[PDB]
Design a protein around this nucleic acid. Sequence first.
RNA 1: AUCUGUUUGGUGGAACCUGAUUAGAGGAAACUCAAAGAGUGCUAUGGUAUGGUGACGGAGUGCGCUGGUCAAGAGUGUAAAAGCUUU
RNA 2: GCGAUGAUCACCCAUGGGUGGGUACAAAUGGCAGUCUGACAAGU
RNA 3: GAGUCCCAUAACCUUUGUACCCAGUGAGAAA
Lengths: 47, 126, 369, 204, 286, 121, 240
Amino acid sequence: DDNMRREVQRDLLLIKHRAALDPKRHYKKQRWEVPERFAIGTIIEDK
Amino acid sequence: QVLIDTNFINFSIQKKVDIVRGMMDCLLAKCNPLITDCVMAELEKLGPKYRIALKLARDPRIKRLSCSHKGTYADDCLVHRVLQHKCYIVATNDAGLKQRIRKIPGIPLMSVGGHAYVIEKLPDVF
Amino acid sequence: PIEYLLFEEPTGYAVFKVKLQQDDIGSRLKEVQEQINDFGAFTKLIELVSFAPFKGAAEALENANDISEGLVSESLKAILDLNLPKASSKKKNITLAISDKNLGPSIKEEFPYVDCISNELAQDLIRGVRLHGEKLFKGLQSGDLERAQLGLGHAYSRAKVKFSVQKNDNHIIQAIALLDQLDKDINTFAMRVKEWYGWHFPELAKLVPDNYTFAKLVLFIKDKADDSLHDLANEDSGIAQRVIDNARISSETDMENVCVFAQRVASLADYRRQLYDYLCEKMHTVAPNLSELIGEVIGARLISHAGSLTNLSKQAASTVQILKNKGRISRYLANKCSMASRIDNYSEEPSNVFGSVLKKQVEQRLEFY
Amino acid sequence: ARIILTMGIRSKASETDLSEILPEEIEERVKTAAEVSMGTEITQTDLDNINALAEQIVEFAAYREQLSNYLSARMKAIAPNLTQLVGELVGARLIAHSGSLISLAKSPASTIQILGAEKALFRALKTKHDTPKYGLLYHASLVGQATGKNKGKIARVLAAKAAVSLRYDALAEDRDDSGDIGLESRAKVENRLSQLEGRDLRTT
Amino acid sequence: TREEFVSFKAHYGLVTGLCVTQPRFHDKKPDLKSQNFMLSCSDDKTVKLWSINVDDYSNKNNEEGLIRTFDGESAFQGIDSHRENSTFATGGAKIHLWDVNRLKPVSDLSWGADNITSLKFNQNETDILASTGSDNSIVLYDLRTNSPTQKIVQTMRTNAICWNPMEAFNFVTANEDHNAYYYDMRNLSRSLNVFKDHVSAVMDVDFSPTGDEIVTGSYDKSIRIYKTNHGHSREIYHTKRMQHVFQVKYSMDSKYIISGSDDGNVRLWRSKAWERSNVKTTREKN
Amino acid sequence: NPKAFPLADAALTQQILDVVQQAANLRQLKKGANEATKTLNRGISEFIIMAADCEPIEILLHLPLLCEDKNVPYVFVPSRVALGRACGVSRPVIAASITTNDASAIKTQIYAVKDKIETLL
Amino acid sequence: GGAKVVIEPHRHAGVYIARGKEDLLVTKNMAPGESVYGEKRISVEEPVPPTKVEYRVWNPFRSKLAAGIMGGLDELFIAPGKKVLYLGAASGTSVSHVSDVVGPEGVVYAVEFSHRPGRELISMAKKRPNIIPIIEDARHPQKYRMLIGMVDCVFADVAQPDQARIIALNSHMFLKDQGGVVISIKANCIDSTVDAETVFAREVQKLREERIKPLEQLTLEPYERDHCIVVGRYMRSGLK
RNA sequence: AUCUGUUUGGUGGAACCUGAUUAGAGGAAACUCAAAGAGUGCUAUGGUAUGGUGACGGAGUGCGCUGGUCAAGAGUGUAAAAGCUUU
RNA sequence: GCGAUGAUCACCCAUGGGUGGGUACAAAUGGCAGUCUGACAAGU
RNA sequence: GAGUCCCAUAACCUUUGUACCCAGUGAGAAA
Ligand SMILES: [Zn+2]
């Protein structure tokens, strides 16, 4: 919902503009407009 | 593995070059000459003025693939299965098929020229 | 000619009677090869006459293994004797269609008046009745065939692999995962019991720091003492008697409630150390060599940090985290644990002998310094 | 836990049945699930520790019910009016949130309304948004009975009446532990809720 | 599957005829449910009999080629087998009768010293042979008396005979004037039908096993199906890749037609070209 | 069927041992059991040579599980003393692995032995 | 390590992409909270309390179907209601990922011959309740003809030089018409005497001779050397 | 700051140009009424329709068919057999 | 009388002591951190 | 009138008390 999109509207900007974050990384070309359905997730490192 | 078509067969008979020995003489290697079913159907369709070519293409040494597509158009069958896989040699004498094959990359091309076979896009012939 | 059909399936054996012969010479044609996907043109071909179910999962597993290695069982003999008519042995036998060309000879050894056909015509009739399945059977069986196939495939696989539940390492996984849980839980509930009796007399909590013994005494001391004889399970009884004399702290329904709560702490702490003994015996009969080498509880936490016995054994001898001469004996102990776990997992019924040898080795190595 | 304490083994379920557990529509499913199953067979030497764990959590359920009955008796001995009005454990977590009963008694009724939802309240105040309306009082029985936005309305009237009953509880001296003030306040909230559920914003 | 079970370099000359058998030996019982048997005569003067490993049953669980080699003094042209009693007959410079046990002809049944080009046994009434000799001649043979029976001489040479499976004395001759004559055995003074639609020399004939229609392949590169009661064609099958069709048979389903040309190929045709081979529900069958 | 299943007989054994000595001379060999599993899960391994007579056998029966995981050929050689002598060390080894190098002067030998033991398996 | 990523669906149904500064291929977890082969997991908090469901990373260097998916195939036939016959379930590394592509309503039949991989398969298929481990040689399908029926796809990652005959047998027995076939070909395992494109051409020719019409192949080149994936549909009547 | 003027995001959308469309472009509602498309589900089952128009059925009888055992035959094989095929 | 079944690889004094960077757990009436609005509404 | 059933039943920090430091490598070690 918009109550979540207005929370995470910033890191979606960073995933959209990944190719500016690091001068040595140079991603392959997609546009990546924000999808209708997504889910924020945290990586679980194992023991 | 050398995919033959019909005018290669007819030009080899008109020049009296054998199939397997002419390919071995041209490449200085071994060869599996292959006749697809559409090339064989084109030879059978060419009539009884070509019975010599038909029973020279029915040879035990010439192995034969089996193409699965409607109709008997040999040039599209050869071009499709050669740009699919890039492991074949195309032996031909059509002007049109020779121009198709020498425009696509990495596919060598054998052709009856003169009194034995010549080979074009293979870079290790000697 | 293909007069009867034999379809074996996880509920039982079914014999179908062929009504019409599918086309032989045009058997690769398009209409012939799609009439076995169509149902309104498959029921013109095949009709059910018999379905003898299985007794249960035991008979289903024995029949699946017999049908695997191509032996006619007693239920198959019974149903073919009921259905297939007594033909000749020398002139026009009756004709059954099967799916297994080395079930064929086994059926002709028992019924020598039966010709068993497994060519592509019988094969695609078979795959027609496997494609349709429950619709052809006219509603007569009990049991979901999907659940039957699930249970039977698991049974067949465990039998073929000789799967053991006595040597089942998930038991020791969950045992140590529960023992840590109720260790911390008994710690919290006994903290709350010590809190609610922290204002009855607050010298019990310094005389007796132990949680289980604290609860077991306080479920019968709730007042002043006067015969403090059994206040050990005797110098502790004298200390408790003197503090209960000159106690310096301040109900009734609260006392009943906190006694119920301390009783709960006692029952949890007797389920613990019962569970310690259970995982100790399951450790000695699941992983005996690690239990001899490093100890049963350390072996439990070793295979639970490594995920399983298989992942512990297949880990390298350096990526085992075991929990100067001291700092190299730990690496020694890690690789010996790796070796003992390999013995322990890949032997079918392991022994104590090599883990005992490696224990002698590591003690010799720590007294090498 | 009670069904594994009764049956133990799948074939034992095939011979027994049971009725004090698992009512009347699920037995046939467990019988067919025992009749065809993908699970193994366990030994007695681990089934006994399984049954010990099962009776441990049956005893845990009985203990949880006994502690809730302790809390119910303590609540209708300490603040019986609130107990008649908002309910036992709802009043318990109100007192537990605010600390002391008298520190709950000296707070205004709007605070008692939004007593739980402080993070939503204070972010909606520090940026000029709209504050929450239910709070910790959402799980009271009357607000559960109300449907729509008049649940926010009767959370307001319930917080007013609960402030009345609760400051009478903590500030009385000759309190009779009878539930009279909580009961007349709850009758007031009940007829308020009935009269704003009887209206309907559709036209007839 | 349209694939060969097996392929034998049988002879060195042309294989000039072949047929099948269930060879009744008096000492070996041949496993007919796993071996199939075909024998074949040629013009290197041999008649060879072969066994074939066959995938039709799964009863058992291999000695394929050349179980025995008969031998002659002249070449052989055609061959046909009795449907019982292990007997066969070959035509060549002369027509001999053989059995599969002895390595020599049981008998010689020759009208005159004119060669024999084709044979067919009868199908029911299984002891009447018929032959086409290259003096335009059709000679019947009867094996109950082990002797020739009657000949008629025609205008042009008969290339094939096929007997009626459902009438037992009628046969159909396919000859060089481009028509095929349906003849009665009990009165050979007149054909009782003439099938008249080819344009070159008719090379082979076969009956459908219903005895209802004949198939007829000729030297114009085409096969033709004739109804038995009409006398003209019912259907022509041709292709551009079919040349000079020499051997035509009607498969035992009566639904398919096998044509063997001289470009090398053997082709399957339908009998009714508009009939599919699926099983039909009752609405579309009606 | 014993636990050390594809036991290479005499000819394949000395073939394996000759390529083991040449790989040890050209530093393409990693020797030992847990070094072998380290390189097996790392990926620098063509094929792996275990012994069939170490003092327990399961100490290296932990390896064919990783081999059938990662499609690596494995062969049990019948003498750990001979395998230590082949590897060129002063102690009997029980497992060795041929690390993957492409600039290698013995690739045809390594590949011929690898194809032979893939037929064996 | 502990970074935050956003999960987004793929073109294929059932598999997802986890975007961050380096994006992962991800599938759902049918047994949450435990890793099948030590791969890193991602835990969203799906919003009655908000439940923590979690997602598991598909390493394409350790999985040929992941190598095919992220090299980019047009049509996998593995979809969230399917019945898949996985041939050569080496252990449960790729089979777990296939299982939770398939979901709870679909079935994965994992066929394996070796017994210690079989033990790993059963100890995984307990907690993934839609994997049916079948320990049997796949070259004789009449043995487990009693246990499976009418799969929708056939994945085949066996390592045998008679690969296409094994696939032809199991497809003729248990695959339905226009069902899916996925083949992992390893050229140096089929035969090292020829080159990789020759053996790829020969195995594709064998597939279309056993009337699996091949749609597509992919060489999966930065992950494995001289492997290939051929997708086909089992046409059963007229490849033409 | 009656400093500054760039950037980023929002609002706005002149002129030229390119593309598409044109009884201008839409939006909402359904236990509404229609015209079509695809996929799916259902024993969806007469290969020539009951067991029988007293023109009939049932009982019983004879003939007919199948199964294997035994006896006799013939063929084959042999010194003689044993053995094997048999519509 | 070795070993691939595994060799080797922050600060202060003439084992022991004093000082700092964190790892897990717990506590805190420690911090963030401040407890919404306030007279109309429903009906005839 | 009015964003909690999405953790003020909580998260982050700070201070204070319990235990530990400041994995890989691969053929050497010893005299
Ligand atoms: Zn073609």
